[PDB]
């Protein structure tokens, strides 16, 4: 709900939204990945394709 520029800054500065993990079979949920590079656009707009 917060300001736009705050959303955009947090978008790259931080992870979040509890994204699923990579290179695993069952698609676990991750909290502290070692070196993972996640970028989720569907979270910000709340839309599915």
């Amino acid at each position: 709900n917060r300001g736009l520029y705050n959303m955009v800054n947090e978008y790259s500065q931080r992870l979040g939204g509890h994204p699923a993990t990579s290179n695993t079979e069952v698609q676990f949920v991750v909290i502290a990945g070692t070196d993972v590079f996640l970028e989720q656009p569907c979270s910000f707009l709340q839309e599915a394709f």
Partner: protein, 49 residues
């Protein structure tokens, strides 16, 4: 290609590698043969290959 094997070898990555083996075997085989069919691709295709 180092981008595929940056995470070591795991089941998901091995499966991606074998799928790409199948694709690339079916597509880019006997390259100079299709080099005649492509037409204007004459030199840039073979040079790139």
């Amino acid at each position: 290609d180092p981008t595929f094997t940056e995470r070591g070898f795991s089941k998901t990555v091995k499966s991606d590698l074998i799928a790409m083996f199948k694709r690339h075997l079916l597509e880019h085989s006997f390259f100079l043969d299709r080099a005649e069919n492509m037409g204007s691709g004459f030199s840039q295709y073979v040079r790139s290959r």
